PDB file of C-alpha atoms in Angstrom:
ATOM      1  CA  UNK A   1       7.569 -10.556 -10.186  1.00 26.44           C
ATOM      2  CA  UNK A   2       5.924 -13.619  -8.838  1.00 25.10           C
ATOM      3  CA  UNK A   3       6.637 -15.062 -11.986  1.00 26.37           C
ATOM      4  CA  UNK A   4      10.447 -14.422 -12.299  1.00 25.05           C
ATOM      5  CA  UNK A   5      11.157 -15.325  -8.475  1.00 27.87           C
ATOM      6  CA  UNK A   6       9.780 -18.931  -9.059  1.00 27.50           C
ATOM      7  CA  UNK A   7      11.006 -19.726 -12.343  1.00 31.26           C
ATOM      8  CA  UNK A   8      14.425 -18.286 -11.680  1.00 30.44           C
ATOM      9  CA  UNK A   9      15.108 -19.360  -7.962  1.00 28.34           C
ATOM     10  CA  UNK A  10      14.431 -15.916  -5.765  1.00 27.94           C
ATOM     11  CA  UNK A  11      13.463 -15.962  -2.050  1.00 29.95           C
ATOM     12  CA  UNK A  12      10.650 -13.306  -2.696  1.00 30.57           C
ATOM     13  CA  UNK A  13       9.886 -11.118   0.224  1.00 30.94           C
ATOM     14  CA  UNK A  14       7.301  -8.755   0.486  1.00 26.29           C
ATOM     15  CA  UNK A  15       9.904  -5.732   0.896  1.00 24.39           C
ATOM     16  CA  UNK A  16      11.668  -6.722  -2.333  1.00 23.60           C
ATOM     17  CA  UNK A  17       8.472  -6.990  -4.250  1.00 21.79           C
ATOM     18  CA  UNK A  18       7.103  -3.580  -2.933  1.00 17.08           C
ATOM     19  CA  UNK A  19      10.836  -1.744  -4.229  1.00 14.03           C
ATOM     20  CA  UNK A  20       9.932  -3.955  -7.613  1.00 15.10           C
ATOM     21  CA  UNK A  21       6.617  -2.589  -8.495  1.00 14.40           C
ATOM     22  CA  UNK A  22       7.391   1.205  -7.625  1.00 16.48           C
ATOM     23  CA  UNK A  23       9.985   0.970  -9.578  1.00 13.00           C
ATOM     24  CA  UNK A  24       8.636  -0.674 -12.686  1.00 11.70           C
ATOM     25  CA  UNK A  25       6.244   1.453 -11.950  1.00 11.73           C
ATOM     26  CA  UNK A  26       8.100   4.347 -12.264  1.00 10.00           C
ATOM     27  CA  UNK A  27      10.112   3.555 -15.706  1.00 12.47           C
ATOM     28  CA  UNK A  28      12.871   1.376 -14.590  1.00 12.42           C
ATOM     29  CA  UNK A  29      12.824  -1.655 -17.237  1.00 10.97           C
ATOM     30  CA  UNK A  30      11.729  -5.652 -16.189  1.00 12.15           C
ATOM     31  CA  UNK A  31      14.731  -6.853 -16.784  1.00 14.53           C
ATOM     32  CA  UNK A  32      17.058  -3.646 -14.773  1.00 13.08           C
ATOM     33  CA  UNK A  33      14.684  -4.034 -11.931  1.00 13.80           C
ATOM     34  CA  UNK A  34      15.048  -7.717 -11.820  1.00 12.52           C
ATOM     35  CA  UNK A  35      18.428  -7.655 -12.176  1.00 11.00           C
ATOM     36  CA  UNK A  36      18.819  -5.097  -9.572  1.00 11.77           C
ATOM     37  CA  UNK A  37      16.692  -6.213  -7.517  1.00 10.89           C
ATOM     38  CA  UNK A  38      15.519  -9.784  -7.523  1.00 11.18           C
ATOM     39  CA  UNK A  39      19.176 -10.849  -8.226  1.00 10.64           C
ATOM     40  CA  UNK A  40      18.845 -12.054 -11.700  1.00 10.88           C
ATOM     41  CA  UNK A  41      19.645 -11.508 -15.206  1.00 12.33           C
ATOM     42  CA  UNK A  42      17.087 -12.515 -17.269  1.00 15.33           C
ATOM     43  CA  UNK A  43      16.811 -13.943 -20.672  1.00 17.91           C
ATOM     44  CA  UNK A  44      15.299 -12.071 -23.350  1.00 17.80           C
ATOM     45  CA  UNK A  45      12.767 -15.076 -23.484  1.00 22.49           C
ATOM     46  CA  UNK A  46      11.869 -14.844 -19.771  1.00 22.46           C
ATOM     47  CA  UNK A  47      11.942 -10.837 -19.846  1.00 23.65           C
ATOM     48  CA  UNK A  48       9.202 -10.908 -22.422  1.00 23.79           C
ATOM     49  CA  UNK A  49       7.325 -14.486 -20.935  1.00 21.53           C
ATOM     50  CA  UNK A  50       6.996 -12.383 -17.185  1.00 19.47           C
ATOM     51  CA  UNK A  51       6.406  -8.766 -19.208  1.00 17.68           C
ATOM     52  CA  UNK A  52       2.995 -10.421 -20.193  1.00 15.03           C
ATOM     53  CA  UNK A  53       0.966 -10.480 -16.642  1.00 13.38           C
ATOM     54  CA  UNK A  54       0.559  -7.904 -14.457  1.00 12.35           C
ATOM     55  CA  UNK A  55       3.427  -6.259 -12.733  1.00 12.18           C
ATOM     56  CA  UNK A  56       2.632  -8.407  -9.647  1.00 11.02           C
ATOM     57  CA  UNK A  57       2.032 -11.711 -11.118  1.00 11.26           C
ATOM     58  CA  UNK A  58       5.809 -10.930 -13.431  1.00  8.97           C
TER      59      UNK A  58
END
């Protein structure tokens, strides 16, 4: 998440980050949840550059 919010240009708040990770967490896709909630559609590049680290450091 980390990841995707400075590459990309997202304010990242601790509240957005916390949503984030449950839901990746949960099932929801890397690129749905940031999409949905980071604000940003990711390229397939970028989806699969963040979906190496950690779910915190994506």
């Amino acid at each position: 998440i980390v990841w995707i919010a400075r590459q990309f240009g997202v304010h990242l708040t601790t509240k957005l980050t916390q949503k984030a990770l449950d839901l990746l967490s949960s099932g929801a896709s890397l690129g749905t949840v940031a999409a949905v909630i980071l604000g940003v559609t990711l390229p397939g590049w970028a989806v699969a550059a963040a979906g190496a680290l950690g779910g915190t450091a994506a």
